[PDB]
Amino acid sequence: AETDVLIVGAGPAGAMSATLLASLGIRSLMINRWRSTSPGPRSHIINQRTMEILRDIGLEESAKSLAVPKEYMGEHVYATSLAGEEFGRIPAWASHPQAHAEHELASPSRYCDLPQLYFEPMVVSEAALRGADVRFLTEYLGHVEDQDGVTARLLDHVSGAEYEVRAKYIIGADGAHSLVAQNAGLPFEGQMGIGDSGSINIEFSADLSSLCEHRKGDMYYMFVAALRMIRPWNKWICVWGYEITKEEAKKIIHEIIGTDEIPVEVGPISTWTINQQYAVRNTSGRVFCMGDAVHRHTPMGGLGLNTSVQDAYNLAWKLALVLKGTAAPTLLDSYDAERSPVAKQIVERAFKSLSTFPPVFEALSLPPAPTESEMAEALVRLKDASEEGAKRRAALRKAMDATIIGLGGGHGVELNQRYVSRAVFPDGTPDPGFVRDQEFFYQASTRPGAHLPHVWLTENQRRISTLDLCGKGRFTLLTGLSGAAWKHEAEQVSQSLGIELKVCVIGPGQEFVDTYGEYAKISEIGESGALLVRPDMFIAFRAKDASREGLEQLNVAVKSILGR
Amino acid sequence: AETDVLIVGAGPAGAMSATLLASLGIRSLMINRWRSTSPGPRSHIINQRTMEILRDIGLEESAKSLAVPKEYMGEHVYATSLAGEEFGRIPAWASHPQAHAEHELASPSRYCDLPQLYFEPMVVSEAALRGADVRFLTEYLGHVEDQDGVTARLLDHVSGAEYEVRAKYIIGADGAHSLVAQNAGLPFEGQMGIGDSGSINIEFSADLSSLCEHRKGDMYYMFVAALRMIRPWNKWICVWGYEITKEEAKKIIHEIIGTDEIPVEVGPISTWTINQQYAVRNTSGRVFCMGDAVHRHTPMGGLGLNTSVQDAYNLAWKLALVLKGTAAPTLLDSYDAERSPVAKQIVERAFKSLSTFPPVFEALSLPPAPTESEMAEALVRLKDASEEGAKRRAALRKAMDATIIGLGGGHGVELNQRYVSRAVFPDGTPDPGFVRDQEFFYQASTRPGAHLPHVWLTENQRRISTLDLCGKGRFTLLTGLSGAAWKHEAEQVSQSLGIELKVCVIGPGQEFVDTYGEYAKISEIGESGALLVRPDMFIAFRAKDASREGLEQLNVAVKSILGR
Amino acid sequence: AETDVLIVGAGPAGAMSATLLASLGIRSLMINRWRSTSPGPRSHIINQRTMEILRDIGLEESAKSLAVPKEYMGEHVYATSLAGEEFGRIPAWASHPQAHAEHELASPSRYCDLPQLYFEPMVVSEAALRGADVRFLTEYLGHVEDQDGVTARLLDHVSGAEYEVRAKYIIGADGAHSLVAQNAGLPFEGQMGGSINIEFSADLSSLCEHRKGDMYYMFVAALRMIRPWNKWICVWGEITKEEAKKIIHEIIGTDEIPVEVGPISTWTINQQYAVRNTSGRVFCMGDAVHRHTPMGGLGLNTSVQDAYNLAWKLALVLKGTAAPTLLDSYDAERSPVAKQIVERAFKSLSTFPPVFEALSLPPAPTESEMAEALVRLKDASEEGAKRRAALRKAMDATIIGLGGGHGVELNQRYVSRAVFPDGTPDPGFVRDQEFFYQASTRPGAHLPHVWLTENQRRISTLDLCGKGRFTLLTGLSGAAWKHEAEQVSQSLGIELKVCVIGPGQEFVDTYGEYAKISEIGESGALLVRPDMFIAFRAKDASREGLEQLNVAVKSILGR
Numbered sequence A, B: 001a002e003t004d005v006l007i008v009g010a011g012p013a014g015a016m017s018a019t020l021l022a023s024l025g026i027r028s029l030m031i032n033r034w035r036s037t038s039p040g041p042r043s044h045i046i047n048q049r050t051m052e053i054l055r056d057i058g059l060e061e062s063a064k065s066l067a068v069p070k071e072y073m074g075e076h077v078y079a080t081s082l083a084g085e086e087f088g089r090i091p092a093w094a095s096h097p098q099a100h101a102e103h104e105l106a107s108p109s110r111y112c113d114l115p116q117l118y119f120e121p122m123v124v125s126e127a128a129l130r131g132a133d134v135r136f137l138t139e140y141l142g143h144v145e146d147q148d149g150v151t152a153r154l155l156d157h158v159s160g161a162e163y164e165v166r167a168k169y170i171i172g173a174d175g176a177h178s179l180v181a182q183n184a185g186l187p188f189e190g191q192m193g194i195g196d197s198g199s200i201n202i203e204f205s206a207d208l209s210s211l212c213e214h215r216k217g218d219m220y221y222m223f224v225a226a227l228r229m230i231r232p233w234n235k236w237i238c239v240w241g242y243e244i245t246k247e248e249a250k251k252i253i254h255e256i257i258g259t260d261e262i263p264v265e266v267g268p269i270s271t272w273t274i275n276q277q278y279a280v281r282n283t284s285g286r287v288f289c290m291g292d293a294v295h296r297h298t299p300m301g302g303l304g305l306n307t308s309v310q311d312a313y314n315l316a317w318k319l320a321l322v323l324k325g326t327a328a329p330t331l332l333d334s335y336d337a338e339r340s341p342v343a344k345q346i347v348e349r350a351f352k353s354l355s356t357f358p359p360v361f362e363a364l365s366l367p368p369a370p371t372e373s374e375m376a377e378a379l380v381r382l383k384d385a386s387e388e389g390a391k392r393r394a395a396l397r398k399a400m401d402a403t404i405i406g407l408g409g410g411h412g413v414e415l416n417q418r419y420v421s422r423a424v425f426p427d428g429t430p431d432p433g434f435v436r437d438q439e440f441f442y443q444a445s446t447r448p449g450a451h452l453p454h455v456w457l458t459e460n461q462r463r464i465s466t467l468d469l470c471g472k473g474r475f476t477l478l479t480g481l482s483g484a485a486w487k488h489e490a491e492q493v494s495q496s497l498g499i500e501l502k503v504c505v506i507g508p509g510q511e512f513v514d515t516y517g518e519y520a521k522i523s524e525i526g527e528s529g530a531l532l533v534r535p536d537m538f539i540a541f542r543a544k545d546a547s548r549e550g551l552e553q554l555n556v557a558v559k560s561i562l563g564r
Numbered sequence C: 001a002e003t004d005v006l007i008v009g010a011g012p013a014g015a016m017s018a019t020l021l022a023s024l025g026i027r028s029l030m031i032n033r034w035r036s037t038s039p040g041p042r043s044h045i046i047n048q049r050t051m052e053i054l055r056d057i058g059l060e061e062s063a064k065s066l067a068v069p070k071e072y073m074g075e076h077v078y079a080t081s082l083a084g085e086e087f088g089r090i091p092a093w094a095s096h097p098q099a100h101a102e103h104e105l106a107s108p109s110r111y112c113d114l115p116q117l118y119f120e121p122m123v124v125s126e127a128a129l130r131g132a133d134v135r136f137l138t139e140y141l142g143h144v145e146d147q148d149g150v151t152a153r154l155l156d157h158v159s160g161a162e163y164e165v166r167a168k169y170i171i172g173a174d175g176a177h178s179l180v181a182q183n184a185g186l187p188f189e190g191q192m193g194g195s196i197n198i199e200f201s202a203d204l205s206s207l208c209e210h211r212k213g214d215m216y217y218m219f220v221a222a223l224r225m226i227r228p229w230n231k232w233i234c235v236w237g238e239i240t241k242e243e244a245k246k247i248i249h250e251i252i253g254t255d256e257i258p259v260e261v262g263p264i265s266t267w268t269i270n271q272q273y274a275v276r277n278t279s280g281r282v283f284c285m286g287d288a289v290h291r292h293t294p295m296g297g298l299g300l301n302t303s304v305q306d307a308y309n310l311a312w313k314l315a316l317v318l319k320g321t322a323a324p325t326l327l328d329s330y331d332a333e334r335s336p337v338a339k340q341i342v343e344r345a346f347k348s349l350s351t352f353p354p355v356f357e358a359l360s361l362p363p364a365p366t367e368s369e370m371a372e373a374l375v376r377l378k379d380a381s382e383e384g385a386k387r388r389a390a391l392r393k394a395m396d397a398t399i400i401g402l403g404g405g406h407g408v409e410l411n412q413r414y415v416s417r418a419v420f421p422d423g424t425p426d427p428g429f430v431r432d433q434e435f436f437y438q439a440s441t442r443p444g445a446h447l448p449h450v451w452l453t454e455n456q457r458r459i460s461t462l463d464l465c466g467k468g469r470f471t472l473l474t475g476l477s478g479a480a481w482k483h484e485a486e487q488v489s490q491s492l493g494i495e496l497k498v499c500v501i502g503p504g505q506e507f508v509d510t511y512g513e514y515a516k517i518s519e520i521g522e523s524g525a526l527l528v529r530p531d532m533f534i535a536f537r538a539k540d541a542s543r544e545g546l547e548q549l550n551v552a553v554k555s556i557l558g559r
């Protein structure tokens, strides 16, 4: 067997890698050890960046059809049981109107709930239909790198046969115990969170619409076990901290529903164990790891799947340009530089969220483990008509509010990627800062290294996002009428370098129109300046004006970005 | 390699076979020669029976989310071009209110438009997630039957390796040139339709919502080329009768749109060639063929995919009962008996529809091939203010009306399955007839051999169909309060035979309630009578009353149905 | 004071009369004794004919905004209480798919639920905004007819003043104790044959949303939706205390939804119909000429249709384009509708009693008697079967009064001087004419609905017509009709629009459903009154066919 890229792993990072490469005409073989995509929905939260990627490759409309919308997600209930009395609620998944506005402003896409159970086959299917070879029941066993490519050895769980694959690169998308990361010898750090422990996950079916429809929520937390909607509102899952459990789980569930009179049907029961670590480096020679393979962490914030897919989006177009000989192999160095700091920041963030929960119990004057008599008292203490009862209600409210960082509040974490690499050609301006907390709030930036900011233009008097002008596996140059020279400069650069760069001259009477003036407003530069946008939506070059010197630079920057 | 059932082919008949078997705990391996599910949407019409199957295995809600609804499908336009003047319209896909009522009455499910492009991965994915092994890039080469099973030889298009699979049965779901049907030596009949010829199919993208949204339709026919919505209303395909075609197709398209000012983007271009035949027998020893493998025909009526899936639904539960030793292998004889007559009837029906089109041209006083001057005159002749112009307008209207048999009018064809086999235990009543034309109109029947009729009951004051009580890979017995004895008779029969049969006693204060009285009305028998329903929704046994003799029979009928 | 038409009464028949007359440029003065439109919800069902009238004067979209749509309306529950066990359901208001199809086929409009409480001000408002003078707190006291008009005496409940109004005609829209009908001396018949109504508020959505119904009958008190699902009224067949809340809790079968008891009012019908609706210059309509049970909700709907029949006639006569003989048709056509609806509404009362007999229940049941019958019904016996079937049969038969009388609603058949007969015999109803609408293009019938297109958009044959004028429908081969209609129009001084339906025309028979429903050649014509009724039908465009249009119009107009 021979391919250009062997993709070990078929979860979110692998499938997306296969889909993007195929889209770019790169031959790839993607392998999974197991029979199917993943039996249970491990991750459900889809952030804006993932939706943006889905939009760019034309899969957002399917993702949207399938997924529960944002409006359903908002009501996060803390309570004793589902049918019991609430302690309080918090506006999760950006459902507070101010959060929602900040959310809407940051992207054309929105939060939805879409379980991995559904997300994966949707992407594996599209990988297959696009150029990509896909082969499950096939186990990566190891590989040996030489100067020209790699040779992987595979074990075929249908035939019993074993075989080799020759490839130019290997992507290690092989999950939380990446054998590909071991064999490439990737250093890992931040091993210690607390003592290693995970969770237990029980799927079930029951029609609790009568308890959910007035107060629609992605999750309901009981003091700590979580009830998470899989479909609204009949498919569910109970999660709690941590182990063999029988069809007694069915009592636990009843007690988590606070009532034993909805018919329940207990599905599968799985345990999730996490050792929290991030790879210091994600690349070794011809090997590139991504997804859980380089960042292993708590589910808090649901950053994993989303960061996993973004790893794939960073790498794909880079592999493709190198494979085609339009970019030097040095281009592949910026994968580690851009995407390695994201791996540490998200493991650290996901862990830090866990510490926002104890204060909820403290507010309740509760120990880490509480007797029901203990918990029943805390509820009484909470309806106390005294100033001490006030202080207490306020303390609980403050404690609850603080958990939001892990439940839709980390907009800054989701969006604020800053890239420093050879891939990103610096424009000479200093880094401006975040005016506000950079974990809670997205700050739009057009400085090289930042994601292209969203704003609405029109095409045929119809709204189109600045993002929809870009991507599609190519470089795009955005300017305005006074920067007409960019067209020509971009033509000469594209001929000489054998690369595709589309230029869009936004303005009145043009194909794309700055009809709300929001482009002029967000660009940070004169009408005649230009922004150059990577196939992965990131700005790699910024021009203040169309002046000759400004025009001359474009070539220097592209060459530099390509390693040429 | 070893499996119980080798499934050659991964299209609609194979995937559905794999999904159902897996659901029944039967080990299966399903193989496809190619990289992906199918690149283009060959078949889009999903009839009620398919929707019913999707409902029973819990995939209807996904099918529905993904698919264009019935209301969109109705407006069938005949015209010169999309932007030109209509000749007339017909209420396609049962959009006439009387058609719609007949439609709604016949099933809990409804027509939708869902291209194969989407349908296939949805089912292949669910097969995989359920027990089934699935392996693409693997070619069936032949097999040799012996007394105990079969040995297939496979060619692996990734490894280059070749290998054997041992299986107890083989399903030949391998399409219009089934190698499995050749090797099993299946006789084929009705070879001659006319001279063998097919069609050319051009995918394209364009935003013709401005020409489609006021008059929403599944297809637009131009005098004969068809414009078919893939997604509304921006993805499309042109089909005409028939050959290399370049990016000139793009002119053809413009002329089929009647205008050259919507931006068009020309996708893939494929040719469909059909030799119309049906297999006289679908079974030979341990081999069972289904789908296009046993019925090859015109798309008129879109019966293929739907009949293909129904073939799978007939067989699966039968294989499973035999594989488990609860049924004799004789049980497998009724596959040919029930499903072979469906194969001939649908090839013949699909062909016969083609002859409803010429009279449209005759009404137009048009030759088989017409010069534009010829066609432009016919339009003039049609606005003529004379009695001869009247006769002409009426003739065209009559001609157009008659095409409906192939565009949603064949409800009888879709639903009127009648089964005679060992599987179906006859109750002694004669065959009642169809009061109305049996190709246009569904006639509900509870006589053994017919599909269980749909009507609404309630469960928790919520509507539930008689169909939702049944299926799930088991036998179900429906009766009423006065037939309480059925419970016990069914218990004794199920113990002694080692089989699952669920009994539902419908009535007031019961789990399921005949709240509209529609069950009493549709059942054709006293409250105390029983209907026994196969896992495939077909009635196999009918009891007039709970009398001892009536009660004694149940055992005789089940034994007989199982071959025991 | 002076006006052309004094409209006594401001309910549905009066307001609609004022609105239509104003629309036709006729001066009218509509009065009403009371402060407001009516406080009570009263009649709620709006049938297709009323909806079509609302469509024609451009008020359907507003009617549809206010109203509960048909899809809410279908689940008719019979039960012990709202929160108790159902006996069964029936598909009310044409919710059975076959009923629904028959319904949808008969008209562009559909059943909705819109309480009088809302319907009335919407129409009184539109009367006022269109030419009409409207004056509440003003009581008709009597009148005296002479040769040239009438003089009504009015009592003004604001000023205390009393005053005279001179008018050409008087419409007696003054309700179930018409003083206008008494003074005109209208004979009444069918004097051969009261309810209490309690409004309340309560959020019973938890009991109603999975089973969406216009009404819930308890065994016999009715729960009726005012707004879904927090507004309610309890009806059954005298004083009441605040104990009324107690009755309501037991009708809800539970006392745990907060309830808020609104007004409490009694309805006391005396069932009669007027043999004649017209005397000299007086014309009565609405409850004034047909008084009956609510069964079928035909009253309001028939009331408005009375107004639609008369208005364009008064207008034509008032303008001198029609002889006063044209007014004679109003009794000829509307009076048989008045008897047929009183008789129908009463006959529906007979269906309910069997439902008890199926239950082996006395007319007045005790809670134990009625607890036994529910046991008797879950019995696992052949005699339990016969009984569950007897109850189902009994329940099914009530549907004639709950959406099943489509024939009653639509099957109007006018014979009179305002309908020019075409020589064909009356064809019959192939099916029961109380349950099933039968479309007809024979003169005397309502113009049948089918869809044409205009700009490739669906438009009903009805939308081509009306608008207070005569319309002539034909096809391309009947092009001569346009000229014949112009000559006739000029000579008679009366507007008649001609529509030549066909390919390349303004209106197109795009589905061929016109050719199919018309009953005549492409070159034939149908002439449609301002009230949607066919008054003339020609088979083809022959000279004799053409020459007859003028005879028919002259004849219709009385000239």
Ligand SMILES: Cc1cc2nc3c(=O)[nH]c(=O)nc-3n(C[C@H](O)[C@H](O)[C@H](O)COP(=O)(O)OP(=O)(O)OC[C@H]3O[C@@H](n4cnc5c(N)ncnc54)[C@H](O)[C@@H]3O)c2cc1C
Pocket: A008, A009, A010, A011, A012, A013, A014, A031, A032, A033, A034, A040, A041, A042, A043, A044, A116, A138, A139, A140, A141, A173, A174, A175, A176, A179, A201, A270, A271, A272, A290, A291, A292, A293, A298, A299, A300, A301, A302, A303, A304, A305, A308
């Ligand atoms: C039970 C469970 C529950 C979870 N719940 C949540 C949650 O509630 N919220 C949340 O945010 N996150 C959750 N996660 C985390 C989530 O699954 C990860 O973020 C995500 O699946 C990792 O993406 P990935 O594609 O990098 O890795 P994976 O999705 O694990 O993909 C790795 C792939 O590589 C394949 N593979 C592994 N080894 C080999 C080999 N030797 N040869 C060939 N193929 C191989 C595997 O079969 C797999 O298909 C959960 C994970 C699990 C297991």
Ligand SMILES: Cc1cc2nc3c(=O)[nH]c(=O)nc-3n(C[C@H](O)[C@H](O)[C@H](O)COP(=O)(O)OP(=O)(O)OC[C@H]3O[C@@H](n4cnc5c(N)ncnc54)[C@H](O)[C@@H]3O)c2cc1C
Pocket: B008, B009, B010, B011, B012, B013, B014, B031, B032, B033, B034, B040, B041, B042, B043, B044, B116, B138, B139, B140, B141, B173, B174, B175, B176, B179, B201, B270, B271, B272, B290, B291, B292, B293, B298, B299, B300, B301, B302, B303, B304, B305, B308
């Ligand atoms: C281009 C095209 C357009 C069409 N358009 C329409 C339309 O507009 N309307 C309509 O009603 N119908 C249409 N059809 C018909 C429709 O495709 C069939 O009804 C349906 O796909 C057949 O179902 P099936 O699963 O039995 O066969 P298929 O879907 O053909 O499945 C057969 C499978 O077996 C596999 N296979 C074949 N040989 C081997 C082998 N030796 N080893 C292993 N695997 C093998 C194939 O890869 C394939 O996956 C179209 C068909 C085509 C090809």
Ligand SMILES: Cc1cc2nc3c(=O)[nH]c(=O)nc-3n(C[C@H](O)[C@H](O)[C@H](O)COP(=O)(O)OP(=O)(O)OC[C@H]3O[C@@H](n4cnc5c(N)ncnc54)[C@H](O)[C@@H]3O)c2cc1C
Pocket: C008, C009, C010, C011, C012, C013, C014, C031, C032, C033, C034, C040, C041, C042, C043, C044, C045, C138, C139, C140, C141, C173, C174, C175, C176, C179, C265, C266, C267, C285, C286, C287, C288, C293, C294, C295, C296, C297, C298, C299, C300, C303
């Ligand atoms: C309490 C009640 C409940 C009802 N419930 C239902 C129901 O549930 N379902 C149903 O189908 N039908 C019901 N009806 C019937 C419905 O109200 C009638 O069909 C409808 O109101 C009659 O329309 P109308 O305009 O002809 O009469 P009305 O609506 O009574 O209009 C007559 C108008 O004339 C005015 N008037 C009377 N006398 C004089 C005078 N001397 N001077 C000036 N003005 C005068 C009155 O104020 C009134 O506004 C109910 C009627 C009542 C009274």
